[PDB]
Design a protein around this ligand. Structure first.
Ligand SMILES: CCC(O)(CC)CS[C@@H](C)C1=CC[C@H]2/C(=C/C=C3C[C@@H](O)C(=CCO)[C@H](O)C3)CCC[C@]12C
Lengths: 240, 11
């Protein structure tokens, strides 16, 4: 019941993922070094991590079937708004339920609540972010469902500033139907129970996290000396 | 709209 096109779409998204996500995290050594102590000591390191991840999110989006057909301005709008959400999704791969932290290959590059707090964020974001990572982890998505969820997150028509919303929605619909059919044919029970609905709920959760993140980003970036620690791409994307 | 680097990475 999974058509040839839908098996094609999945193969593409999986490939795009493999070419844009490095599970060895080798490049992290290029970042400004993580400093754990106290005042914003993790901002330069995590800011570089984010900036790096935006580049990977961009590379992924471009390989989403139909994404290229959008106008450059719609592409910009979709990436600007979803980037932090897709990074949070991407990060679930490094997130371990063992100690509720993001474990990226080593101890220096192991990130926990106190590391995120030392990036300038409060529990008002961090609590639901971990809550999100745990609940997403519990879903035990196939990698196919993971990459589909990320594509669907990027191509949302209700994003602020979207012009050709009809065209965006058509692209997303084709992806949603690909996901829904995949779960029915490829994801066995009980793991497939209400799985689509739960995955959609996660997209709602990400909107909320995106909103809280923006508020706290405006606070942090409001101060030039902290804004000074970010990267040009992070300012361009998370900025106005 | 005024996103040089984002648009450059998109092309
Ligand atoms: C520095 C402040 C800033 O708000 C950005 C302006 C981000 S802090 C907070 C909100 C946040 C979101 C993603 C989280 C994390 C992501 C982890 C990743 C590691 C790996 O899974 C990965 C690899 C890509 O190769 C992901 O893209 C990102 C864990 C730590 C905390 C991170 C950075």
């Amino acid at each position: 019941k999974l058509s040839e096109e839908q098996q094609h779409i999945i193969a593409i998204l999986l490939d795009a993922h493999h070419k844009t996500y490095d599970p060895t995290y080798a490049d992290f050594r290029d970042f400004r070094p993580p400093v754990r102590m106290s005042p914003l000591s993790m901002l330069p390191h995590l800011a570089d991590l984010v900036s790096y991840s935006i580049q990977k999110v961009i590379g992924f989006a471009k390989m989403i079937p139909g994404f290229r057909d959008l106008t450059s301005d719609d592409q910009i709008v979709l990436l600007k708004s979803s980037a932090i959400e897709v990074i949070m999704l991407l990060s679930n791969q490094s997130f371990t339920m063992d100690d509720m932290s993001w474990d990226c290959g080593s101890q220096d590059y192991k990130y926990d609540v106190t590391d995120v707090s030392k990036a300038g964020h409060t529990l008002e974001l961090i609590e639901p972010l971990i809550k999100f990572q745990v609940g997403l982890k519990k879903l035990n998505l196939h990698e196919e469902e993971h990459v589909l969820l990320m594509a669907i997150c990027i191509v949302s028509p209700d994003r602020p500033g979207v012009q050709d919303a009809k065209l965006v929605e058509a692209i997303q619909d084709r992806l949603s139907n690909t996901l829904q059919t995949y779960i029915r044919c490829r994801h066995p029970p009980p793991g497939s129970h209400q799985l689509y609905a739960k995955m959609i709920q996660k997209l709602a959760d990400l909107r909320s996290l995106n909103e809280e993140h923006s508020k706290q980003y405006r606070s942090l970036s409001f101060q030039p000396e902290n804004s000074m620690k970010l990267t040009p791409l992070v300012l361009e994307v998370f900025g106005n | 709209k005024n996103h040089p680097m984002l648009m450059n990475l998109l092309k």
